[PDB]
Amino acid sequence: QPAVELAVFNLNSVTDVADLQMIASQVQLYLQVCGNTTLEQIKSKANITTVANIFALTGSVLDLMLYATDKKTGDAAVQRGALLAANLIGLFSEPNNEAHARMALRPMFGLMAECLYRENGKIKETDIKRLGLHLNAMIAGDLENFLKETQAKLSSLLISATTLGVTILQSMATPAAEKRDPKLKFTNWAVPLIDLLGKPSQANLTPKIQPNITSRLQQEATQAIAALSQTLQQQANAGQKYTLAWLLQETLKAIQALENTGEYERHTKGDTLEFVSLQADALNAPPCEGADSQSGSISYSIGAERVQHADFYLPKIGFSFIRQYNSQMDEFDQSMVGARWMMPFSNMIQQNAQGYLFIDSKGRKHQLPVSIIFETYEVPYEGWIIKPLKNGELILDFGGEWRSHFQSFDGGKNYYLVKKMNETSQEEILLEYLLLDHIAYLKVINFKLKQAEYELKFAFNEQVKIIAVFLDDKAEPLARYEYDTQGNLIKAIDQNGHTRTYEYNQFHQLTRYTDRTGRGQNIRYESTEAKAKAIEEWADDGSFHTKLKWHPRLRQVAVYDAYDVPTYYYFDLDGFTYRTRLADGRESWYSRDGKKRITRQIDFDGRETQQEYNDQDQLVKIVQPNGGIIRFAYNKQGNLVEIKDPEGSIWKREYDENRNVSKEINPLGHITQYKYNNDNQLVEVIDAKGGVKKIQYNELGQMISYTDCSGKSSTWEYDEDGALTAEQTANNKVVQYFYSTKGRDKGQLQSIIYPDGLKEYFEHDEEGRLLKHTDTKGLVTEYKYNQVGLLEQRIDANRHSVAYQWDKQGRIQKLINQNQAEYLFGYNPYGYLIREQAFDGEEKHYSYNENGRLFQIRRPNILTQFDYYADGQIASKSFTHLHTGQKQTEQFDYNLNSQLSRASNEVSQIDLYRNALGQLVREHQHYKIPELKPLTAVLHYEYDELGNLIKTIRPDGHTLNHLVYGSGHIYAIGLNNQEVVSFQRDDLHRETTRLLANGLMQTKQYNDVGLLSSQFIQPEQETQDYLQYQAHRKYHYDKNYLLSQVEDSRLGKLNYQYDPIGRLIAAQSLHKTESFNFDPAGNLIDSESVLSPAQIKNNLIKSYKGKHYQYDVQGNVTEIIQAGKNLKLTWDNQNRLIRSDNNGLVTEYGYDVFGRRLYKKTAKELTLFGWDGDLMIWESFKSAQTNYTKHYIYEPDSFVPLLQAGYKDFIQLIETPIYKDPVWNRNLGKERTALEQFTFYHCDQVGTPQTMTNIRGECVWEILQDTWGAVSQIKALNQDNPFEQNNLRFQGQYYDRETELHYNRYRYYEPHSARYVSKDPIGLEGGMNTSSYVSDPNQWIDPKGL
């Protein structure tokens, strides 16, 4: 720990002078203890002239005091002298012209000391940002120049500081205010301290530094004055560490290293810094409940253990019996609900020596003057008023329409909320008080609310302690309580019977308390005093063990985690946490204006989000971390009408009489009108096209119906209590929800009944954790939870457990899959993940930069490295090869909305353009294929009123129209202003029919559960001239809603089987009977071969059914050897296939930034690819003999293909040079290369093309795919016709004519083993098995390769 520590803050954030009071009191105590003289006695002979910097004056005086009394040596002496000099320099007057410069430099020195004195401390870039802000806020100079001139002028400052210190010490060695104005001078230095001490700060002023029970005194002052010259003259020695010269030198070095109208208004706001070495105890906790203001809950500001426990809920009125504990609530020691326990409506106003003490419902004291009974008053920083009445009843206006009346029953000593009111809702809670021995005891709560009426009768024992909370006339108590002989609430049984047990020591302090499941949360307090702070708390098993240590001098707490990793929080006098210094040194900050509203938040990683409010106290400028200014505007009624996002796109609004938004004119002008019911709820919303959606609510306010824009109403039903008992679909299908009435999970969702009669059953514990889920088929998925409550095991229907392990902080430590392969996670002493064993021994090491963002991922082969922007959006990635050294870099650019705007890599650059609303309107894709003249493919998007996509002009000028019906339902897909399919939809807006342009008529019929039940395709009109396509697929599902049979007309009956989890383990049919063997993790196994392992432990299969695989050190397949085939895959640093050598026929692949293959070169043949997002819209082929382009048209918002139209030429794309190129040539695309051949797809239930038909309706192409995508036989009428051939496969895939690998977007899917040839780019975010494709290909897709 540094010998001397400080609290650097802003002048605006502090209104009281409590810290100044503490410093003055400490000085007075030192004077009394040493010189035996009060400040008044020494005031006379204290005529010394100094600048009117009260902060610097107090700091210097306090500094001088410690130096004279408390002697220090070593580095501690150097630091103390440095801080004394820093406080002095901003204190002496002459020269007057430099007073502002010196008083600005003093907080600079304070900040550099606070940030450099720490062991392994440095000037982070945020430090330089803060220094620049503080400097510029006052003189508006340059940080480098100011620091340099200070360094050159340091000697004069130190000389004048020595003179000032000599003068100050020449006031005591010999035996006998509130304005920080540079131009004002203190005639006497003692006078401001005396004036401070007189101020009624209302903050405890007990000195926190004890003198040494010694003597010396004047001897001490003589020694101090003698050594002042020695300690200050040597301060300038930059060679000496931890000195003003060293601070300036280090700050300059950091600045040099890191260099490679409304602003002025906020400068007047007071972002100027200010630091003190002594601070007063926080008055109380802040209203904030964030992780920075209270632990997982000891509030840091006061160290009070408060636990808010809800006993029962009255759903029809929205009342939860929140019992609030506060180990510092000595006023509620005799509280009827339990000692130091607060129930709802127990807040009251007590009488003390100071005056009236109000204890809000949250448990936060608010001392009020004795004049509240005679006049109105308002507590600062909250915004609620107290007003009296002639009848002695005090009304609290907490903010809103609620007025709470308080009455006194004993000489105006205790004011108990007799009842409340609500001129608005016309409601009002009535509290009936039983009086005994002049002690008012709450007896009945009358909830005379229009929602419902209740009589919360209470029952007391001999001690007058609530033992049961009844309702109206119910025999069952909503809440039962038990108290030990000391009056402590040692057990609180809620309405469901789930007891909570509380353990107290002999002083009403809660040491341990168990949740409803029996899991304790132990606590220990520094002492048995009522106000003693909680200093330690750990779950019963030791997890989450946290040690709080409050700094003796400052308003700081060192919150040690389970591994003694401190996190030093600093809080204001009101408890607001204005700083958070992590163990690694990253400091988060929070500025606050006089009203304690945040105006600047420098996060740990440097992100800064400011909040400039208007004269009406409304945030009218939220500058983002990226520099985007969002200027809100408000109308005369104080309503947010006009919002202006960073790009200038203005969201207008208009409000009705009830301050509800009745209009919403987005930037493009698509007005969205709402309507509300008298209860201030959305009853009806009108879109921009006129579509009207009607919403209905019941007496409770729970939505009970939603009439879609097309007159389709789905009704939600609720019992009297308000628990959802059914939700009916637009076609009258009821999903009835059933809740438990007894057991551990009483009152929770016990089961769900589905429209086909199948019942899901659940099981929870008392705290809501799922313990056992039974699926519709009866398969049980038991979950096991460890002592701390975190999931520790999940036993699925096969009895295969994914055992998790968590370290003492609740972070995942080791994850064990079904194969007993351990996925070790490693965390550095600072608590960041810095390792990952990936089930295969592949250790990924994570590095972090000074901003704490991920900096490198050192995989065994590739060393990823990230470069970020000021906002933290990645600016580039650098995948260096640790062995070969080849480096691949991607570069990103973002607009002011934080949306990707230009992504580039070696072989592409994608420029994304967006309209005011933020939707993609243009997408220029600058291909950079090697050996090929660079060319640009230009996508366009035209949108309708409701933001749907209605027209996309593909690069070669071909336009795909989506003619939309209503609120986004497609009734036809055009193609060059020529229809290619027209849909017909049912009540639920499900497609029940589509008329293809080739005269075919595909009707889909869905069963009760909405699963596809049949699919017939046939011509609208039949002709004997030719054999038009005609086939059908009737799908039958088993109890688990897994496709268990298909009555296909072409393939016959396809019967499937599944294992309990849901993995497909067989698929029999006439064509081929198949069987699959998955290990517990999910890897296909070669069961037929005995020597093959029974489980692929590392998830990387080395052999499966005649294919032997060879993986590199990153888990990607680098070779696949079988009978007569030797495929070698070359993976780039992004783990992407950039070359394939199949029996010597080398291929070459290339990808844009997003992993979308842009080409595939095979000797002279080149297959360009084009994407409009995640979908391969077109592909173009270049070769000596065959040139063609295919345009794949997919169904709306899906990867299922619809038709492919092409022309016998290479695609016509915008040759790279911009604004002139696309628009002119895109109109040259309006001339267009006419699509020669159309061909329509016909997929199965999951979107896999099963056949194809030309424009005349005939079948032209059939594929018999194996279950896992492997092509078994293709029946094409014209093999050579490239437009009658299909390379599409499982939804989102593409067959490769050279490798037989299906190219998913991000990975290559190798159908033989039904697993990707490389590990998932997103690691475990995709699943436990990172190489497996899917469990069930009949209903799961994985279209993007993740």
State the DSSP H helix or E strand holding residue 83, giving kind and residue range, or none if neither: helix 75-89
Q: Which residues contact 1168 (CB under 8 A, 6 or more apart)?
A: 927, 929, 1158, 1159, 1179, 1180, 1181, 1182, 1210, 1211
| Alpha carbon distance 1305, 490 (integer Å) | 59
Domain contains 398: yes
Of 284, 958, 836, 799, the closest CA to residue 555 belongs to 284
Q: Which residues contact 219 (CB under 8 A, 6 or more apart)?
A: none
Instruction: Provide the token pair at 663.
Output: 């209009």
Q: Considering its fold, how many domains does the chain have in total?
A: 4
- 1018: Cα separation from own chain's centroid: 51
| Alpha carbon distance 386, 355 (integer Å) | 14
Q: Which residue has the tokens 């780019």?
A: 1321
Q: Counting beta carbons within 10 angstroms of the beta carbon of residue 777, is it exposed (0 to 12), middle (13 to 18) or buried (19 or more)?
A: middle
Domain contains 885: no
- 721: Cα separation from own chain's centroid: 33
Specify whether the CB–CB gap between 1166 and 1157 falls below 8 A: no
| Alpha carbon distance 157, 713 (integer Å) | 79
Is residue 442 domain-shared with residue 420, that is, in the same domain?
yes
Q: Which residues pair with 743 in a beta bridge?
A: none
Domain contains 1218: no
Q: What is the DSSP letter of 650?
A: E
| Alpha carbon distance 873, 898 (integer Å) | 8
| Alpha carbon distance 1305, 1320 (integer Å) | 12
Cis link prior to 95 (omega < 30° from 0)? Answer: yes
Residue 62's SS3 state is helix
Q: What is the DSSP string of 834-883?
A: EEEE-SSS-EEEEEE-TT-SEEEEE-SSEEEEEEE-TTS-EEEEEEEETT
Rama region for 1106: left / alpha / beta (φ>0; ψ in -120 to 50; rest): left
| Alpha carbon distance 1288, 1303 (integer Å) | 9
Is residue 597 domain-shared with residue 646, that is, in the same domain?
no
Residue 633's SS3 state is strand
| Alpha carbon distance 606, 979 (integer Å) | 54
Residue after which a domain boundary falls, among 276, 295, 324 = 276
Of 36, 83, 21, the closest CA to residue 208 belongs to 21
Phi, then psi, of 231 in degrees rounded to 5: -75, -25
Is residue 15 domain-shared with residue 137, that is, in the same domain?
yes
Cis link prior to 1321 (omega < 30° from 0)? Answer: no
| Alpha carbon distance 1267, 433 (integer Å) | 74
> Is the dihedral angle over the CA atoms 333, 339, 340, 346 positive or is it negative?
negative
Domain contains 495: yes
Q: Which residues contact 35 (CB under 8 A, 6 or more apart)?
A: 42, 172, 175, 217, 218
> Is the dihedral angle over the CA atoms 766, 771, 772, 773 positive or is it negative?
positive
| Alpha carbon distance 6, 385 (integer Å) | 36
Q: How many CA atoms lie within 13 A of 403 on its CB side?
A: 14
Is residue 387 domain-shared with residue 532, that is, in the same domain?
yes
| Alpha carbon distance 474, 904 (integer Å) | 69
Is residue 359 domain-shared with residue 451, that is, in the same domain?
yes
Q: What is the DSSP string of 1102-1163?
A: SEETTEEEEE-TTS-EEEEEETTEEEEEEE-TTS-EEEEEETTEEEEEEE-TTS-EEEEEET
Specify whether the CB–CB gap between 46 and 194 falls below 8 A: no
| Alpha carbon distance 853, 871 (integer Å) | 11
Cα Rg of the chain (Å, integer): 37
Residue after which a domain boundary falls, among 543, 567, 602 = 602
Is residue 431 domain-shared with residue 313, that is, in the same domain?
yes
Q: Counting beta carbons within 10 angstroms of the beta carbon of residue 424, is it exposed (0 to 12), middle (13 to 18) or buried (19 or more)?
A: exposed
Instruction: Provide the token pair at 192.
Output: 């401001």
Q: Which residues contact 942 (CB under 8 A, 6 or more apart)?
A: 921, 949, 950, 951, 952, 953
Residue 225's SS3 state is helix
Of 301, 306, 289, the closest CA to residue 342 belongs to 306
| Alpha carbon distance 511, 1082 (integer Å) | 47
Instruction: Provide the token pair at 1108.
Output: 């032997």
Is residue 417 domain-shared with residue 322, that is, in the same domain?
yes
Q: Which residue has the tokens 């062991």?
A: 119
Q: Counting beta carbons within 10 angstroms of the beta carbon of residue 84, is it exposed (0 to 12), middle (13 to 18) or buried (19 or more)?
A: buried
Q: Which residue has the tokens 């109208």?
A: 261
- In this structure, which long-range contacts are made by residues 94-99, counting pairs with CB atoms below 8 Å and at least 24 apart in sequence? 94/160, 99/51, 99/182, 99/183
Domain contains 394: yes
576, amino acid identity: F
Is residue 229 domain-shared with residue 149, that is, in the same domain?
yes
CA dihedral 247, 252, 255, 258 (to 10 degrees): -100
Domain contains 1331: no
Of 65, 84, 134, 145, the closest CA to residue 105 belongs to 134
Q: Counting beta carbons within 10 angstroms of the beta carbon of residue 1088, is it exposed (0 to 12), middle (13 to 18) or buried (19 or more)?
A: exposed
CA-to-CA dists, residue 213 to 61, 71, 765, 1290, angstroms: 21, 14, 60, 85
Is residue 443 domain-shared with residue 423, that is, in the same domain?
yes
Range of the domain at 640: 613-686
CA-to-CA dists, residue 447 to 348, 456, 520, angstroms: 19, 8, 34
Residue 211's SS3 state is coil
Question: Strand (E) positions, 423-505?
Answer: 429-436, 439-447, 455-460, 466-469, 479-483, 489-493, 502-504
Q: Which residue has the tokens 């919002």?
A: 643
Q: Counting beta carbons within 10 angstroms of the beta carbon of residue 398, is it exposed (0 to 12), middle (13 to 18) or buried (19 or more)?
A: middle
| Alpha carbon distance 450, 427 (integer Å) | 6
Q: Which residues pair with 1162 in a beta bridge?
A: 1165
Of 1316, 1341, 1343, 1345, the closest CA to residue 1245 belongs to 1341
| Alpha carbon distance 963, 969 (integer Å) | 9
Instruction: Provide the token pair at 661.
Output: 């938004």
State the DSSP H helix or E strand holding residue 1283, giving kind and residue range, or none if neither: none
Is residue 241 domain-shared with residue 359, that is, in the same domain?
no
Residue 1032's SS3 state is strand
Is residue 113 domain-shared with residue 260, that is, in the same domain?
yes
CA dihedral 297, 299, 304, 307 (to 10 degrees): -30
Residue after which a domain boundary falls, among 632, 661, 686 = 686
| Alpha carbon distance 456, 444 (integer Å) | 6
Of 427, 425, 388, 424, the closest CA to residue 408 belongs to 388
Specify whether the CB–CB gap between 612 and 265 falls below 8 A: yes
Task: Please state, as a whole number, how many other Cβ atoms lie within 10 Å of the Cβ of residue 438.
Answer: 10
| Alpha carbon distance 80, 59 (integer Å) | 12
Q: What share of the chain is helix, strand, coil (3-state, %, to 5)?
A: 15, 40, 50
Instruction: Provide the token pair at 527.
Output: 């002492």
Residue 245's SS3 state is helix
Instruction: Provide the token pair at 693.
Output: 């959606």
Of 678, 674, 656, 676, the closest CA to residue 665 belongs to 674
Q: Which residues pair with 416 in a beta bridge?
A: 348, 407
Domain contains 754: yes
Strands 1012-1019 and 1031-1037, sheet pairing: antiparallel
Of 339, 786, 772, 768, the closest CA to residue 516 belongs to 768
Is residue 327 domain-shared with residue 265, that is, in the same domain?
no
| Alpha carbon distance 391, 1252 (integer Å) | 88
Q: What is the DSSP letter of 504?
A: E
| Alpha carbon distance 41, 1060 (integer Å) | 89
| Alpha carbon distance 952, 91 (integer Å) | 70
How large is the greatest C-alpha to C-alpha distance in the chain, in angstroms?
127
| Alpha carbon distance 238, 235 (integer Å) | 8
Phi, then psi, of 145 in degrees rounded to 5: -65, -40
| Alpha carbon distance 1101, 1079 (integer Å) | 11
| Alpha carbon distance 1277, 1044 (integer Å) | 32
Domain contains 878: no
N residues, the chain: 1346
| Alpha carbon distance 502, 1287 (integer Å) | 67
Question: Strand (E) positions, 669-768?
Answer: 673-677, 681-686, 692-697, 703-707, 713-714, 716-718, 724-728, 734-739, 749-753, 759-761
Of 544, 542, 589, 584, the closest CA to residue 567 belongs to 584
Q: What is the DSSP string of 27-44?
A: HHHHHHHHT---HHHHHT
